[PDB]
Symmetry: D2
Subunit: 236 residues, 4 copies
Amino acid sequence: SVSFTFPNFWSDVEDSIIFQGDANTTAGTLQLCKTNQYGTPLQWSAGRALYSDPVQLWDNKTESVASFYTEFTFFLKITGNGPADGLAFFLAPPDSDVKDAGEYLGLFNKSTATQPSKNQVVAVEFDTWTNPNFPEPSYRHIGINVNSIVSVATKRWEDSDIFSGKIATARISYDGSAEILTVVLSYPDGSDYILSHSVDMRQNLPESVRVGISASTGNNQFLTVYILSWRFSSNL
Amino acid sequence: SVSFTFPNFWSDVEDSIIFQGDANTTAGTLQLCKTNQYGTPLQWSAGRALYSDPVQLWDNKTESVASFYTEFTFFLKITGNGPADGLAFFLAPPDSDVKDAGEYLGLFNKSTATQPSKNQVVAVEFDTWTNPNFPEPSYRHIGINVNSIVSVATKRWEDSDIFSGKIATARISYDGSAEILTVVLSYPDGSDYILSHSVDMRQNLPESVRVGISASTGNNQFLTVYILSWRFSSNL
Amino acid sequence: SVSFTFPNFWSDVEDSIIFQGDANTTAGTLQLCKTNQYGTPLQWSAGRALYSDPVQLWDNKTESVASFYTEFTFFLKITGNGPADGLAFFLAPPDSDVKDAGEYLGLFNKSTATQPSKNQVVAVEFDTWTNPNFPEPSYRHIGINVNSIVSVATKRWEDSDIFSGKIATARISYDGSAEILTVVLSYPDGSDYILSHSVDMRQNLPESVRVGISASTGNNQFLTVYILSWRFSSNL
Amino acid sequence: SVSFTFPNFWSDVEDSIIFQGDANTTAGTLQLCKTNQYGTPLQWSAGRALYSDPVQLWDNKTESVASFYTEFTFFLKITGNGPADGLAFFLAPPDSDVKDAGEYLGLFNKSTATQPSKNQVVAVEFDTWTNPNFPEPSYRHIGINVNSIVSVATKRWEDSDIFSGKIATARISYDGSAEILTVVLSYPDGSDYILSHSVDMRQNLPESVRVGISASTGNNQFLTVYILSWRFSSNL
Ligand SMILES: *[C@@H]1O[C@H](CO)[C@@H](O[C@@H]2O[C@H](CO)[C@@H](O)[C@H](O)[C@H]2NC(C)=O)[C@H](O)[C@H]1NC(C)=O
Ligand SMILES: *[C@@H]1O[C@H](CO)[C@@H](O[C@@H]2O[C@H](CO)[C@@H](O)[C@H](O)[C@H]2NC(C)=O)[C@H](O)[C@H]1NC(C)=O
Ligand SMILES: *[C@@H]1O[C@H](CO)[C@@H](O[C@@H]2O[C@H](CO)[C@@H](O)[C@H](O)[C@H]2NC(C)=O)[C@H](O)[C@H]1NC(C)=O
Ligand SMILES: *[C@@H]1O[C@H](CO)[C@@H](O[C@@H]2O[C@H](CO)[C@@H](O)[C@H](O)[C@H]2NC(C)=O)[C@H](O)[C@H]1NC(C)=O
Ligand SMILES: CO[C@@H]1O[C@H](CO)[C@H](O)[C@H](O[C@H]2O[C@H](CO)[C@H](O)[C@H](O)[C@H]2O)[C@H]1O
Ligand SMILES: CO[C@@H]1O[C@H](CO)[C@H](O)[C@H](O[C@H]2O[C@H](CO)[C@H](O)[C@H](O)[C@H]2O)[C@H]1O
Ligand SMILES: CO[C@@H]1O[C@H](CO)[C@H](O)[C@H](O[C@H]2O[C@H](CO)[C@H](O)[C@H](O)[C@H]2O)[C@H]1O
Ligand SMILES: CO[C@@H]1O[C@H](CO)[C@H](O)[C@H](O[C@H]2O[C@H](CO)[C@H](O)[C@H](O)[C@H]2O)[C@H]1O
Ligand SMILES: [Ca+2]
Ligand SMILES: [Ca+2]
Ligand SMILES: [Ca+2]
Ligand SMILES: [Ca+2]
Ligand SMILES: [Mn+2]
Ligand SMILES: [Mn+2]
Ligand SMILES: [Mn+2]
Ligand SMILES: [Mn+2]
């Protein structure tokens, strides 16, 4: 059983959050990627914020899988028409470090991003940029990734919400018995996105893992991701 | 596309909410079942609060199913050791009225509660009382009901949370493409319940329906359910 | 050095709040005056909710009036054009009990309401009814009462806010050194009422007092006051 | 009759807020003074954020000082034992620009900071550093400044709250009729600071003024002030 709550990141979350890549706290929020003194986000950057304590995903001698829930708010600071690349919530082995930037969201490497058998990561992505390098929706989208940058299921993410300049609330749940991952993205306006898909953690990740949030950028400099709050709870 | 938000029920929600059975507003909240002048809940009562506007669940000539999300907070005013019977969120034909009280949660009739083919209702229940009349967990529980008072899937609901005297937050989502219903129950302490199950609305409900919240009581008078807030959104 | 916080009144505030007259808790709120089973407020009723623990207002040889701050939210459920009589925050001797209803706000008796030397109560009133019995604004108003139902200072209270059907936030502060009482009434719309006046508690109240909120009604039955939250802190 | 509300500073408040000195927005907040790429605050810096629209303070032949109320939250990011210099809310002529840093809080010049007749500024200061250059409390404090860096009235500000690492809420009100300025500083823990003092804006400021918040630093580099939200309303 694991749980934590960050109403904000004003306190010294140093002894509770592992910062990878560019990740760090900025004025009570988590800023995954670096910006210059002029507030302009740097190109090809990546960062991740992983919770220190590990999570018992499942048991082998019991085959019993754990359930978990996470909720976090984020703001997309967009100053252009081509924001990239987005952010993602994810689970990975405790020693997993930041990977490639750009379309890989700091989760995979260029060489194996499309090879599930060569990865150990499950994530829900909020993709603000359609990439031609591999198969994916031609529109902004939300998706569930199982050991691959190519989502197993996606949902269209409206630009009116992406460029809304409003605080979004992401909720992700997983029922260990049913083996179902669900994501709900909500905007203060009146729009909710719902995406669910069956996924068995036992065949995609080790018994013990860490949870975190990742973000990255490519050539454009029109986007900076900020996480305002974050809580999580898990039960075997 | 349908959506609404009730941060509270202080306003005159008369021209937006259909009250069934005992249901009504009480000091900014929805109180489904009646209590006396001494605050004591009456026995064998039932009540439902349905949103006026109908929701397009699915399309026949398109086979396309809609997705929706709902969130609401509730408080369990318990004054004894045997609180019953609980509450539930549900979807049913627009002309569906309150049914039997007690273990039926105002959703089914005594005679057909266990006969799916004789019902038109999908619900997520928060059952505070184990009934011997039909099969169900011997402990307090949360469940998904598909045209029957006998849940297709359940999750244990800890008494420490039920008798916590705290405001609970219920979240229910449905992905029309994946045909998955998910429920998350959260307590300000640090406990989250997650329950997901595949369910196809097309074979359980008509194209157009109404959403609502229901509650009922039996012989005991140790429980009074109050809904503090409620919002919903749906998209075809 | 006394302080307390009530984010709501869902818990059993029995062993912390002294209920006088009709006062009691109702669905997470404080309802000072009673209503029938039809939700209709009874005529000529009065009620007060005083915090159990007494507050040290001042001292003699020590010479040091205590400072305090209190904040609370309330809703005016109005169903007619003649709401009466309103509510008030007050300080009085620990053994002070509810007084007369109607225009006296449960704070004074009919025979001495206009005689300062015969009373022991300082209060901030939110008067929704202009009375001709004694001098007072011919319009709804907010006021500072020092041992009298006749305010020493008042501020007009716009009807657009009174019948707004929105939750109001009251803030009352007192600087024991400057001997100044300040009241600020705020509405979510965009209106703030400010009223300050010099007042020396030492010559109007005993060294030890209790703080509370009261309300009352007269002939009309168009108003029911509800207090949703309440907090207070003091320092000698 | 001017009013504005900033629940945060995530939006482009460019066409609503005049940034002076180092002031600017940082991740949804206002950062008055600059910090390097290492998050270290620069020495001897100053910045102010004034609301664009001017406020009508008072009139002559009309005789009617306007009343106003303002509320804002701020966080003191402290990394050392000598945080300086603090922040302040103020009113000054519309064309007033940032002044000297250090102990002057960006509000006065070194040569005239102690000369009321040479200044046009009324403010509430939150001084985290006792200066020996001029008379002031030998302990951290809150104060009301009338055309001088030497407060006419002050209140001790406990270090437990200053180094608390929690978000503080400041509330400032002014009754134009009573000519009374009141400040209330509140911490989520359970401490409220109250300070009131008589002040006539008519003899200290022009008929039209601008309101804002300022901050500054000296030699030490242990403090960085952040304003998370800010709202204000006024009425002639
Ligand atoms: C406020 O109302 C409550 C209603 O609950 C009163 O307490 C109840 O009193 C009845 C008997 O009159 C008991 O059967 C209940 O068990 C009590 N309820 C609780 C929660 O204890 C209470 O007396 C009223 N307070 C005042 C001052 O009249
Ligand atoms: C919900 O409760 C309200 C109580 O406010 C009921 O309204 C009252 O109804 C009675 C008759 O039943 C009238 O005499 C009163 O004038 C009504 N009160 C007000 C303020 O108008 C209402 O009937 C209840 N709703 C339902 C569906 O039962
Ligand atoms: C506050 O900082 C912002 C940083 O964004 C400054 O505005 C930027 O100015 C640079 C050039 O110096 C431009 O490339 C950016 O496009 C601007 N950003 C935005 C959002 O417009 C701004 O000048 C600073 N304000 C002050 C008073 O110094
Ligand atoms: C996150 O940002 C902070 C900025 O506050 C970094 O802390 C500074 O690190 C430099 C050296 O890298 C030190 O000289 C400063 O003294 C530090 N500042 C403070 C206030 O202690 C921190 O290094 C960053 N964390 C990571 C993992 O990069
Ligand atoms: C014009 O298309 C761009 O070509 C680049 C090589 O010339 C590169 O493929 C780029 O994609 C990269 O940047 C975008 C936008 O910033 C995004 O971050 C991608 O993930 C990243 O690979 C093409 O857009
Ligand atoms: C002692 O068991 C009770 O027997 C009753 C008949 O004598 C009846 O079955 C009752 O159940 C009813 O009340 C409970 C508790 O209030 C609950 O509401 C059930 O749904 C309702 O059927 C038995 O508990
Ligand atoms: C018909 O008007 C009533 O006259 C009374 C004397 O005959 C008395 O003034 C009464 O006022 C009372 O009711 C109002 C409205 O409820 C209010 O509560 C007053 O405080 C109360 O004295 C008149 O309505
Ligand atoms: C070494 O102490 C410094 O002496 C200065 C004169 O030589 C001056 O008093 C200085 O104070 C300055 O820095 C502090 C801390 O940052 C504060 O900002 C004061 O306002 C500023 O004048 C002393 O630190
Ligand atoms: Ca992409
Ligand atoms: Ca049951
Ligand atoms: Ca009156
Ligand atoms: Ca100083
Ligand atoms: Mn993608
Ligand atoms: Mn059940
Ligand atoms: Mn009055
Ligand atoms: Mn000072």
